[PDB]
């Protein structure tokens, strides 16, 4: 598309993408240089710094920061490429239409449309960070259902998203009410 794709998403994502999340740092006692100029320890900390997280007891990296990491890792400006899109969701369905000369999958398959081995590995970015309940009554009544009847329950929860300062470029889902389907 000669550049970034054009599409509209939630306001939270837009405002998050506006920011940078750089975590400033002061002159470490290990620096050897004048006031101005920064060597390797006084440089701003990127929002996706793994050491900072595990040192702060944060287990995943606040997906927007993961997007910042991926954009920094590649996509040089003004040259070097034409903006290869950084994110792509996994897809394991076999391409029914490859045709190097072979027929569809049921009776033929080349080495180009053969789903390669899948390597499971624990994810590192959690899209939504903090789930927050406006009032404890929302879940108290839900549990009260089981209290009275004794049977289990199940219900969808409605709400909206917002920023979450406690984690670098983090998101919170604020739930306002719970709705119970017929089960």
């Amino acid at each position: 598309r000669y550049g970034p794709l054009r599409i509209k998403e939630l306001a939270v994502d837009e405002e998050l993408e506006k920011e940078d999340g750089l975590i400033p740092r002061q002159k470490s006692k290990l620096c050897k240089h004048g006031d101005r100029g920064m060597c390797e320890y006084c440089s701003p900390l990127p929002p996706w710094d793994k050491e900072y997280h595990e040192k702060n007891k944060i287990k995943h990296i606040s997906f927007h920061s993961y997007l910042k990491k991926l954009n920094e890792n590649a996509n040089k400006k003004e040259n070097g490429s034409s903006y290869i899109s950084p994110l792509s969701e996994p897809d394991f369905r076999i391409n029914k239409r490859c045709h190097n000369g072979h027929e569809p999958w049921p009776r033929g398959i080349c080495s180009k449309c053969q789903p390669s081995a899948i390597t499971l590995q624990q994810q590192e970015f959690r899209m939504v960070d903090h789930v927050e309940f406006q009032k404890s009554e929302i879940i108290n009544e839900f549990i009260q259902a089981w209290r009275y009847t004794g049977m289990q329950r199940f219900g969808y929860m409605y709400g909206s998203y917002s920023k979450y300062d406690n984690t670098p470029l983090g998101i919170k889902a604020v739930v306002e009410a719970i709705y119970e389907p017929p089960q």
Partner: protein, 564 residues
């Protein structure tokens, strides 16, 4: 019954199009030419085990499974594989070499495992491991651990495959020796096929196959192009045609205005390739097969060489009778001779004798020039003596012409050659013909029985032989009517064939000089006798008296030592 299978679309105006009479795959046997024997072998090895499995149940044997094709790149190995796979109409699993090697570590074995497992589940199946050399190079070539894991996985899958399951494995590789040796044993890629560069008729067939859609101008002489192209592989011919079309469009581009996206329909419909375009494309093109040793047929009879009748009869007795009439040899229990060694002054036509011998027995011809021998000695050439004789075996019957043995036989290479020749199968028709201008310097070990022991002297051309050579060389050149060459032949006593070639080339040079001068002035379409006189005034012998005396003395010594 050499084929017995070829003798009798693609499992399929509107009706003809539907019946087939960018992804236009399923190329049938019609889309291949010049490799009839190899295609016959592949069909015999692939169809019958799958199409008609009951034959082997009836006769009570297990049909072979491992087929390995190797030949110069661009000869159409993948084309033949895909054609056979689509014609048989069986579950066809295609494994690329580089594509499998491009996966992460550990994901390049699972692909092979699942490929073979699927081929087993949906039998009958054909598995074509293209460019197997990329996933199984020579043992010393690669030492990486993953390169050994993949090879071991391939070997395990291949060995475990051998069962009643109707699955056939086909592999391709340009260099026969590149593949790991362990892949060429029993229960593995045992049957081997060698692809050789096509001959004149094969080149014409390829040209017709490719040049069936071009808007060729009516003045095209595809026969002439086929004759001119010597050593052109199929890919080279395709590139030739593409470049000729490019030249035609470039010439027509003058009327085309690049500014406009579209072009006038009349101009677009006036495109046509002319013979000069093909000539220009031939000028630009550059074949690559000849850089390495390959297999090519030859069609020289006992008429392009003059004289040497006694030597011709000796060669006949040596080579022709065992191949044509092995039954009488079996009756007498005498095995035929292995090799022969031609020696004599340079330029006497030893190569022509070798080619004639190869043609008489209808055997393929392999050539090894002196520079190839030196390059192998220095170990900077991809090929190897073992590879040469492996291809000779795979393409039997064959005639291997070892030229300029003096360079190496002034040794590691000589030892390898001796071992390979000794290990040659007695009954397998693999003849070796050695050429050398210094029979004294040749290592005697090569002359022992069971080796190149049959020495043959090649004398300088005789007067009648010189006349015949001169007639043969000048037949395809416009000469003056009523022109006599007997006087020139008589005046050229002691001249070698190369000397006569030089004389005729000088005459042609003078003729072209005069023609160009006339064109500039404006005439001389023939080679008048004055041109011959002018050329003869300059040309002269290339063999010194001492050389002839030495050769005669050596031949006389050989005659004396062979009789009393």
């Amino acid at each position: 019954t050499a084929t017995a299978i070829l003798r009798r679309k693609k499992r399929k105006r509107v009706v003809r199009n539907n019946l087939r009479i960018n992804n236009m795959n399923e190329v049938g046997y019609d889309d291949i030419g010049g490799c009839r024997k190899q295609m016959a072998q592949i069909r015999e090895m692939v169809e019958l085990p799958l199409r008609h499995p009951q034959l082997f149940k009836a006769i009570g044997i297990k049909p072979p499974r491992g087929v390995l094709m190797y030949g110069p790149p661009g000869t159409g190995k993948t084309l033949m594989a895909r054609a056979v796979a689509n014609e048989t109409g069986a579950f066809f699993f295609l494994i690329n070499g580089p594509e499998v090697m491009s996966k992460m570590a550990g994901e390049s074995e699972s692909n092979l495992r699942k490929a073979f497992e699927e081929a087993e589940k949906n039998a009958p199946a054909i598995i074509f491991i293209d460019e197997i050399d990329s996933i199984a190079p020579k043992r010393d070539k690669t030492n990486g651990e993953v390169e050994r894991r993949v090879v071991s996985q391939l070997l395990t899958l291949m060995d475990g495959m051998k069962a009643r399951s109707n699955v056939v494995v086909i592999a391709a590789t340009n260099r026969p020796n590149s593949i790991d040796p362990a892949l060429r044993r029993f229960g593995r890629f045992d049957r081997e096929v060698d692809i050789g560069i096509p001959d004149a008729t094969g080149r014409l067939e390829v040209l017709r196959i490719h040049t069936k859609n071009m808007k060729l101008a009516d003045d095209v002489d595809l026969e002439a192009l086929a004759a001119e192209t010597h050593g052109y592989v199929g890919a080279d011919i395709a590139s030739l045609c593409s470049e000729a079309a490019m030249q035609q469009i470039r010439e027509k581009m003058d009327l085309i205005d690049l500014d406009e996206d579209e072009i006038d329909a009349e101009v677009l419909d006036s495109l046509g390739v002319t013979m000069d375009n093909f000539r220009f494309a031939l000028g630009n093109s550059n074949p690559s097969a000849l850089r390495e040793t390959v297999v090519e047929s030859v069609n020289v009879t006992w008429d392009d060489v003059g004289g040497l009748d006694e030597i011709k009869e000796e060669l006949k007795e040596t080579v022709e009778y065992p191949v044509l009439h092995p039954d009488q040899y079996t009756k007498f229990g005498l095995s035929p001779s292995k090799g022969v060694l031609f020696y004599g002054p340079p330029g006497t036509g030893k190569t022509l004798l070798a080619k004639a011998v190869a043609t008489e027995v209808s055997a393929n011809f392999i050539s090894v020039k002196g520079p190839e021998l030196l390059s192998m000695w220095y170990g900077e050439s991809e090929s190897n003596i073992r590879d040469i004789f492996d291809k000779a075996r795979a393409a039997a019957p064959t005639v291997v012409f070892l030229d300029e043995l003096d360079s190496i036989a002034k040794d590691r290479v000589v030892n390898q050659l001796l071992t390979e020749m000794d290990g040659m199968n007695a009954k397998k028709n693999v003849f070796v013909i050695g050429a050398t201008n210094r029979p004294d310097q040749i290592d005697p070990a090569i002359l022992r029985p069971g080796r190149l022991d049959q020495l043959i002297y090649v004398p300088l051309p005789d007067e009648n032989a010189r006349l015949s050579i001169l007639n043969a060389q000048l037949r395809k050149t416009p000469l003056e009517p009523g022109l006599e060459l007997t006087a020139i032949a008589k005046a050229t006593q002691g001249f070698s064939g190369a000397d006569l070639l030089y004389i005729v080339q000088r005459a042609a040079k003078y003729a072209i000089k005069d023609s160009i001068e006339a064109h500039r002035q404006h005439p001389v379409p023939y080679i008048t006798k004055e041109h011959f006189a002018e050329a003869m005034k300059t040309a002269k012998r290339s063999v010194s008296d001492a050389e002839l005396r030495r050769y005669e003395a050596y031949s006389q010594q050989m005659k004396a030592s062979r009789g009393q």
